[PDB]
Enzyme design. Sequence first.
Site, PDB file in Angstrom:
ATOM      1  N   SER B  31      38.710 -11.241 -21.713  1.00 17.87           N
ATOM      2  CA  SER B  31      38.585 -11.797 -20.355  1.00 17.87           C
ATOM      3  C   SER B  31      39.161 -10.885 -19.261  1.00 17.87           C
ATOM      4  O   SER B  31      39.851 -11.346 -18.340  1.00 17.87           O
ATOM      5  CB  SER B  31      39.200 -13.211 -20.267  1.00 17.87           C
ATOM      6  OG  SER B  31      38.580 -14.125 -21.170  1.00 17.87           O
ATOM      7  N   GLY B  33      36.788  -8.585 -18.272  1.00 15.75           N
ATOM      8  CA  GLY B  33      35.442  -8.523 -17.697  1.00 15.75           C
ATOM      9  C   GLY B  33      34.560  -7.434 -18.280  1.00 15.75           C
ATOM     10  O   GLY B  33      33.709  -6.886 -17.576  1.00 15.75           O
ATOM     11  N   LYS B  34      34.749  -7.121 -19.562  1.00 12.63           N
ATOM     12  CA  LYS B  34      33.993  -6.033 -20.191  1.00 12.63           C
ATOM     13  C   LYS B  34      32.498  -6.345 -20.346  1.00 12.63           C
ATOM     14  O   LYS B  34      31.665  -5.448 -20.224  1.00 12.63           O
ATOM     15  CB  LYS B  34      34.659  -5.498 -21.480  1.00 12.63           C
ATOM     16  CG  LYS B  34      35.189  -6.543 -22.452  1.00 12.63           C
ATOM     17  CD  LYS B  34      34.385  -6.586 -23.745  1.00 12.63           C
ATOM     18  CE  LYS B  34      34.639  -7.889 -24.520  1.00 12.63           C
ATOM     19  NZ  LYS B  34      36.093  -8.175 -24.781  1.00 12.63           N
ATOM     20  N   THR B  35      32.169  -7.616 -20.571  1.00 12.86           N
ATOM     21  CA  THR B  35      30.773  -8.038 -20.640  1.00 12.86           C
ATOM     22  C   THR B  35      30.160  -7.981 -19.243  1.00 12.86           C
ATOM     23  O   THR B  35      29.120  -7.346 -19.029  1.00 12.86           O
ATOM     24  CB  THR B  35      30.643  -9.457 -21.231  1.00 12.86           C
ATOM     25  OG1 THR B  35      31.495  -9.580 -22.377  1.00 12.86           O
ATOM     26  CG2 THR B  35      29.200  -9.747 -21.642  1.00 12.86           C
ATOM     27  N   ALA B  36      30.837  -8.628 -18.299  1.00 12.22           N
ATOM     28  CA  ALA B  36      30.412  -8.660 -16.906  1.00 12.22           C
ATOM     29  C   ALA B  36      30.327  -7.261 -16.279  1.00 12.22           C
ATOM     30  O   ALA B  36      29.737  -7.091 -15.216  1.00 12.22           O
ATOM     31  CB  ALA B  36      31.336  -9.562 -16.097  1.00 12.22           C
ATOM     32  N   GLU B  59      27.738 -12.206 -28.977  1.00 13.26           N
ATOM     33  CA  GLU B  59      28.583 -13.378 -28.709  1.00 13.26           C
ATOM     34  C   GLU B  59      27.846 -14.461 -27.939  1.00 13.26           C
ATOM     35  O   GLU B  59      27.471 -15.490 -28.509  1.00 13.26           O
ATOM     36  CB  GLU B  59      29.881 -13.010 -27.979  1.00 13.26           C
ATOM     37  CG  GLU B  59      30.946 -14.119 -28.050  1.00 13.26           C
ATOM     38  CD  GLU B  59      32.095 -13.934 -27.062  1.00 13.26           C
ATOM     39  OE1 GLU B  59      31.876 -13.318 -25.986  1.00 13.26           O
ATOM     40  OE2 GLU B  59      33.213 -14.425 -27.361  1.00 13.26           O
ATOM     41  N   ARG B  68      24.495 -15.279 -15.747  1.00 11.56           N
ATOM     42  CA  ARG B  68      25.602 -14.370 -15.469  1.00 11.56           C
ATOM     43  C   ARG B  68      25.149 -13.095 -14.757  1.00 11.56           C
ATOM     44  O   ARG B  68      25.968 -12.422 -14.124  1.00 11.56           O
ATOM     45  CB  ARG B  68      26.393 -14.038 -16.739  1.00 11.56           C
ATOM     46  CG  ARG B  68      27.649 -14.881 -16.934  1.00 11.56           C
ATOM     47  CD  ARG B  68      28.256 -14.643 -18.313  1.00 11.56           C
ATOM     48  NE  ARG B  68      29.511 -15.370 -18.537  1.00 11.56           N
ATOM     49  CZ  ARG B  68      29.623 -16.695 -18.709  1.00 11.56           C
ATOM     50  NH1 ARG B  68      28.554 -17.491 -18.659  1.00 11.56           N
ATOM     51  NH2 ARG B  68      30.820 -17.237 -18.911  1.00 11.56           N
TER      52      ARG B  68
END
Lengths: 102, 121
Positions: B31, B33-36, B59, B68
Amino acid sequence: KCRRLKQESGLGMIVIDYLQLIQEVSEISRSLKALARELEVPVIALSQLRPMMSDIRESGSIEQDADIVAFLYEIIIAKQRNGPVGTVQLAFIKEYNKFVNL
Amino acid sequence: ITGIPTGFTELDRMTSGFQRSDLIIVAARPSVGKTAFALNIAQNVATKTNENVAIFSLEMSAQQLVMRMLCAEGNINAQNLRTGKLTPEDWGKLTMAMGSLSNAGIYIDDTPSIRVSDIRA
């Protein structure tokens, strides 16, 4: 002041900024109701305190004089004599300072 | 600049892309923000260039991913997409955000957890 404005220009709403700050409050509540009645105009009296009924009630009547009691939390119309009682939900901008539809 | 642009001015400079044959690993604690971050690169490479991107989203689901990056565009959401109803400002926004991302070159695969051979296939 509201009386003089009605005869000279029109009038439709009296929006008083907060009651607790006007100058026992039960005796003011009473007078605000009469004001609305005399001028055939909706008077919006803002008040200061979850929420629910007994939060304001414990500090000066109001309950039996106001015929519609809104809460900002969600807009909770907790009492109205027109008919329905429930929760209406409004969006709020901040930057622009607007309350907006949904 | 080489490359494939990131979208992000000064990331571009140090790297000049993203270029072809290089394995880039972006690591960050839960959390942060590596995905974002990876999504926004994916997006900018899809909407701004003309170059198909493949996203494997082991995931999060394929459609919980799209909002997103629908949110990441039309600058939409507090109102919110999740919590049902929107304002005439949100609607009239999604429509463009949906329209601009509509012609993008994104391909998503959410297949639960997959072996490398499959990614490669």
